[PDB]
Symmetry: C4
Subunit: 90 residues, 4 copies
């Protein structure tokens, strides 16, 4: 469980490092600093306006942005539930 | 589990083939090519703006569009969770 | 499981009968006929724009509309997961 | 289970007391009275427009508003599922 929470933090920071670099210049309100990114990625992880709100307007500049977001969502959303189930089991 | 992931991919591609044909001409931004569709259907699967954002404006042109989306949502959303639970069970 | 699916259908139709009567005249696009309602209630059940999209504009006319929606959401969302878990267990 | 439901109500009321005080003057439609807050926090708990709809416009006035909402979401969303699983377990 502690190992799962460790993996998620490592993935979460690395993803926010990558997102800052990739879309920060073109989309500063969402990926401007590392902070803005960690906030946006948590939001995208919770799925609130992930597509119409974030990915779709982002893809209008970077057409392959989905190669980062869809796997991010697939990974984090799986891990978060898996971690929460693990807490409940323990 | 691998069989569940196989079913989902087959369903996902067939649904995106169908959606492209059905609503692609009337709604090109969302169902224009097969690619646009696979992206939209994953989004509809995660439920982000599925109705107000997609189904409702789609239904304004095709009034029975709900016959495709509601079962799609019921099937995929069930399968995804069922697959993820299956991964967790096979891990323990 | 079949009993759970039966309860949900009964609740779902009764809620759509009630919603049609309550907000159909004032909000026809969402609760006009019984059909429009069954569609809106499934959407509200999935949570897509339940508040900002439906409840909030509805409450601007009917200020207590939350007494119907919040319990509806609490009941249906519990039952749906409970049913899906039941299918998986069986 | 009853203890979990008790914790959630205590947390839910305290959070809505805090939110009313913090953002009520600047955002009255959402955190004006204690009632408006309990409604908004349930909505934020279900995640419907939590960020683009609530937190993001709130953060434009209070830049650290995320210190209240993100932990609120992490706590309540965990507890709600944990309670619902607990009901299901106690039923079997
Ligand atoms: C999985 C854990 C996810 C944790 C996510 C934390 C996001 C933190 C966001 C943040 O620090 N700011 C908001 C940036 O938008 C800082 C600004 O408020 C300063 O001014
Ligand atoms: C079950 C997993 C489902 C995965 C879904 C993947 C969607 C891929 C979408 C896609 O490839 N595009 C977005 C269409 O909007 C095309 C553009 O990236 C285009 O510019 C490339 O050229
Ligand atoms: C839990 C099961 C939930 C099932 C919900 C079914 C909704 C059916 C909606 C419907 O029949 N219409 C859309 C009404 O908006 C009909 C119109 O398309 C006609 O023209
Ligand atoms: C854990 C369960 C959380 C339940 C949350 C209940 C929210 C109740 C909200 C509420 O009472 N109002 C909506 C405020 O927008 C006030 C109006 O109904 C007012 O007009 C009555 O008079
Ligand atoms: Br998912
Ligand atoms: Br809920
Ligand atoms: Na939304
Ligand atoms: Na959602
Ligand atoms: Na959701």
């Amino acid at each position: 469980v502690g190992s799962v929470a460790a993996l998620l933090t490592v993935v979460f920071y690395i993803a926010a490092v990558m997102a800052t670099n990739l879309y920060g210049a073109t989309f500063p309100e969402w990926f401007g600093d590392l902070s803005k990114s960690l906030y946006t990625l948590f939001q995208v992880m919770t799925l609130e306006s992930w597509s119409m709100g974030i990915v779709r307007p982002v893809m209008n500049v970077h057409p392959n942005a989905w190669v980062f977001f869809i796997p991010f969502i697939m990974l984090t959303t799986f891990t978060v539930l898996n971690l929460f189930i693990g807490i409940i089991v323990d």
